[PDB]
Design a protein around this motif. Structure first.
Motif, PDB file in Angstrom:
ATOM      1  N   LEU A   1      -7.211 -24.628  32.221  1.00 19.17           N
ATOM      2  CA  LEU A   1      -7.300 -23.232  31.813  1.00 19.17           C
ATOM      3  C   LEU A   1      -6.530 -22.318  32.752  1.00 19.17           C
ATOM      4  O   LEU A   1      -5.844 -21.400  32.296  1.00 19.17           O
ATOM      5  CB  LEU A   1      -8.762 -22.781  31.742  1.00 19.17           C
ATOM      6  N   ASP A   2      -6.631 -22.559  34.062  1.00 24.44           N
ATOM      7  CA  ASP A   2      -5.750 -21.893  35.011  1.00 24.44           C
ATOM      8  C   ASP A   2      -4.297 -22.278  34.763  1.00 24.44           C
ATOM      9  O   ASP A   2      -3.398 -21.432  34.848  1.00 24.44           O
ATOM     10  CB  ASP A   2      -6.157 -22.245  36.442  1.00 24.44           C
ATOM     11  N   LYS A   3      -4.050 -23.554  34.464  1.00 24.62           N
ATOM     12  CA  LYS A   3      -2.693 -24.014  34.187  1.00 24.62           C
ATOM     13  C   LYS A   3      -2.134 -23.368  32.925  1.00 24.62           C
ATOM     14  O   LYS A   3      -0.950 -23.019  32.873  1.00 24.62           O
ATOM     15  CB  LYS A   3      -2.680 -25.538  34.070  1.00 24.62           C
ATOM     16  N   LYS A   4      -2.968 -23.209  31.897  1.00 31.15           N
ATOM     17  CA  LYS A   4      -2.510 -22.586  30.660  1.00 31.15           C
ATOM     18  C   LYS A   4      -2.178 -21.112  30.864  1.00 31.15           C
ATOM     19  O   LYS A   4      -1.185 -20.613  30.325  1.00 31.15           O
ATOM     20  CB  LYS A   4      -3.570 -22.751  29.573  1.00 31.15           C
ATOM     21  N   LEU A   5      -2.995 -20.401  31.641  1.00 33.85           N
ATOM     22  CA  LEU A   5      -2.837 -18.963  31.805  1.00 33.85           C
ATOM     23  C   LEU A   5      -1.855 -18.578  32.902  1.00 33.85           C
ATOM     24  O   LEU A   5      -1.453 -17.411  32.967  1.00 33.85           O
ATOM     25  CB  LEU A   5      -4.194 -18.317  32.098  1.00 33.85           C
ATOM     26  N   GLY A   6      -1.453 -19.516  33.753  1.00 36.66           N
ATOM     27  CA  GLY A   6      -0.606 -19.194  34.881  1.00 36.66           C
ATOM     28  C   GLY A   6      -1.335 -18.710  36.112  1.00 36.66           C
ATOM     29  O   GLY A   6      -0.684 -18.238  37.051  1.00 36.66           O
TER      30      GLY A   6
END
Lengths: 37, 83, 83, 42, 41, 137, 204, 49
Positions: F11-16
């Protein structure tokens, strides 16, 4: 060395001028690249 | 010549019986590869494969640890020296 | 103590002031074409073959030097000199 | 490279239109000199 | 640096009609443009 | 027919948002490697560390700014000291983080008002600089 | 290939990049009624007809459909041979054609006209085939809903079809920036992967 | 000695442009040579490689 070559190159063809519309030659050079055409 | 560099950190894996021992022009032991050898580097995330073409030197050993951008393989006048 | 043994512009001037393959064919053609063809055909056809071969190789050799240096010149200018 | 062999080179001269048999004529055969073959090779 | 002033009308015609810097935009070597913007341009 | 249908990490990876480049759960060791006795001479580690003149990391602007941003919480780093990978990534997107800081100063000026904001550079000014104090004066 | 040559004025002629697609046209003033029982495909500007590949069940009765094409612009700078040769050439290259059924076969000028996005037929130029699109409906309401509120989103080279509510519409800037962010994020990590401290570093 | 340092130098030159393209696209030294206005990779390699 570049100037000495340029002087000899100009000297050997200094007399070549476009003097006729068509020399009427029949022969041609066969070619079988785009810039050379 | 062309140098193959390791794309990741990890452990080199190949069969040393498929290659021929040799000494390089720098005095190092190495392997001569006359086939399409499959060399595996197991990194921290995934496992990656590098294809070693024939007529190439393999400079690393099986199970050796390599760093990223490290040369692992090489794809391949009369002077007088006084000592 | 010990002794070891280990292993452009002038090129254009050399060509323009006048290839091993060119010299062997000219020598080869000279000693055979007259022995095959008769009067004004041995010399006539032999001269055409030598001259056509020479022009093809001279232009290629000159353009090989300039094209390796990235210099673009139309074959018109070189053909005028070689003529 | 034109072939080093003579007859192969003659064939390449015709294929590349360097020279053909249409260019092989002398003053005797284009000016109708039928009598000159009597004065030669005897 | 040399500066020449054509005197005769024949020489002035040649200078204006043959040697000006806008009818010679192409180089004779391969036909490339001569005055392509460079450096700060 | 059958053509109409009705209906932490990653989720952090998806949002940057800041996150490790490699998922710690999907991260594995590198087993055991040659221990200098199964190795040729040219691949053995020297017994004593060798002086290099390249043994210290080169200082730069990116390292200093990343550490300062790490203390304010604007970014999170893998460790205490930014890596060469993180400084390279910062160099690419450094203008974005500066714009965020500049925007926060504009919003703070719009909140406190000019008196409170610019009193940072007037040390001799001791009067209360809040908006209510300005209105009361 | 068929042994005959059809009368092309009894058919819809649909021109794509690599084929001409023919679907029988029952007479109608609006010229938007399609008879899918008889279809042909031809190489472009040719009269040699063959049966196209059919990858889905086709409508059996007449249906009214709206046609729209899917493709790209080929804007080139052709070589300048003749005097006053154009500096550019801009042509449209059509790879897919969408046939969207009118809801209840209503006419365009009907005051209750809406499109039926659940029934869409796709013609593909590369494969010379026709198929029915698989559509995902995310609007709440099921089969009985206000069709005036739904929006069709087409992605993935005309292969993904999603029906959303018109209030969930994305800004065109958002659509473009999403694609750029996804691509540059993957390219940057690929560039940074070869640094030997990558495994002990964070994205931020 | 000759071959290890030549390969190291050539690898630095190869990686120079992608580093500029990915991390500092508007670097002033990169823009001068990459745009073709002034300087080539070899001269830049002498400054930073």
């Amino acid at each position: 060395d570049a100037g000495y070559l340029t002087r000899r190159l100009v000297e050997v063809v200094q007399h070549i001028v476009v003097r006729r519309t068509d020399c009427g030659t029949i022969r041609g050079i066969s070619v079988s690249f785009i810039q050379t055409l | 010549a062309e140098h193959v560099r390791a794309p990741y950190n990890g452990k080199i894996k190949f069969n040393e019986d498929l290659v021929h021992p040799t000494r390089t022009r720098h005095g190092h032991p190495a392997f001569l590869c006359y086939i399409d050898l499959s060399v595996i580097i197991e990194s921290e995330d995934i496992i990656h494969s590098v294809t070693i073409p024939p007529k190439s030197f393999l400079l690393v050993q099986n199970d050796q640890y390599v760093e990223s951008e490290q040369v692992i393989a090489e794809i391949r006048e009369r002077v007088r020296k006084y000592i | 103590l010990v002794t070891f043994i280990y292993e452009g512009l002038p090129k254009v001037e050399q060509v323009l002031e006048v290839s091993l393959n060119l010299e062997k064919r000219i020598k080869g053609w000279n000693r055979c074409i007259t022995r095959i063809l008769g009067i004004p055909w041995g010399f006539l056809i032999g001269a055409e073959l030598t001259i056509v071969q020479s022009r093809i190789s001279l232009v290629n050799k000159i353009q090989k030097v300039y094209r390796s240096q990235g210099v673009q010149i139309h074959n018109r200018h070189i053909e005028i000199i070689v003529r | 490279w034109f072939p080093e062999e003579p007859f192969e080179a003659f064939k390449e001269m015709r294929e590349r239109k360097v020279f053909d048999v249409s260019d092989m004529y002398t003053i005797a055969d284009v000016w109708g000199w039928t009598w000159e073959k009597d004065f030669k090779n005897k | 640096m040399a500066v020449h002033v054509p005197l005769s009308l024949e020489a002035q015609a040649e200078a204006r009609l043959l040697m000006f810097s806008h009818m010679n935009l192409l180089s004779p070597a391969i036909g490339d443009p001569i005055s392509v913007p460079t450096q700060d341009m | 027919n059958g053509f109409v249908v009705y209906n932490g990490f990653e989720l952090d990876k998806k949002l940057g948002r800041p996150h490790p480049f490699i998922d710690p759960t999907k991260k594995k060791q590198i087993e055991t490697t040659l221990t200098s006795d199964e190795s040729w001479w040219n691949w053995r580690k020297p017994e004593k560390e060798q002086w290099s003149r390249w043994q210290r990391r080169r200082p730069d602007v990116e390292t200093v700014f990343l550490k300062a941003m790490a203390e304010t919480g604007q970014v999170k780093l893998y460790g205490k000291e930014p890596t060469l990978t993180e400084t390279s990534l910062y160099r690419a997107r450094r203008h974005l983080f500066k714009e965020e800081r500049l925007q926060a100063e504009r919003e703070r000026l719009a909140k406190e008002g000019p008196m409170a904001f610019y009193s940072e550079w007037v040390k001799a000014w001791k009067r209360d600089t809040s908006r209510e104090a300005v209105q009361k004066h | 290939v068929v042994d005959y040559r059809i009368n092309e004025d009894e058919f819809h002629k649909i021109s794509l990049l690599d084929c001409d697609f023919f679907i029988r046209k029952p007479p109608d003033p609006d010229n938007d009624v399609y008879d899918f029982r008889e279809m042909y495909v031809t190489p472009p500007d040719t009269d040699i007809y063959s049966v196209p590949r059919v990858l889905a069940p086709m409508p059996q009765k007449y249906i009214r459909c709206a046609m729209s094409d899917y493709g790209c612009y080929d804007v080139t700078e052709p070589p300048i041979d003749a005097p006053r040769d154009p500096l550019y050439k801009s042509e449209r290259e059509i790879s897919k054609v969408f046939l969207t059924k009118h809801y209840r076969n209503r006419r365009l000028n009907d005051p209750e006209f809406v499109l039926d996005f659940e029934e869409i037929y796709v013609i593909d130029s590369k494969t010379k085939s026709i198929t029915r699109a698989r559509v995902l409906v995310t609007v709440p309401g099921g089969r009985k809903r206000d069709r005036k509120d739904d929006l069709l989103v087409i992605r993935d080279n005309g292969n993904s079809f999603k029906i959303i509510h018109v209030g969930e519409r994305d800004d065109p800037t958002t659509v473009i920036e999403r694609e750029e962010w996804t691509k540059t994020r993957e390219d940057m990590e690929k560039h940074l992967r070869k640094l030997r401290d990558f495994s002990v570093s964070n994205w931020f | 000695s000759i071959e290890i340092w030549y390969a190291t130098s050539e690898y630095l030159r190869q990686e120079m442009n992608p580093n500029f393209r990915m991390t500092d696209p508007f670097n002033p030294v990169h823009m001068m040579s990459f745009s073709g206005a002034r300087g080539n990779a070899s001269q830049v390699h002498q400054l930073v490689g």
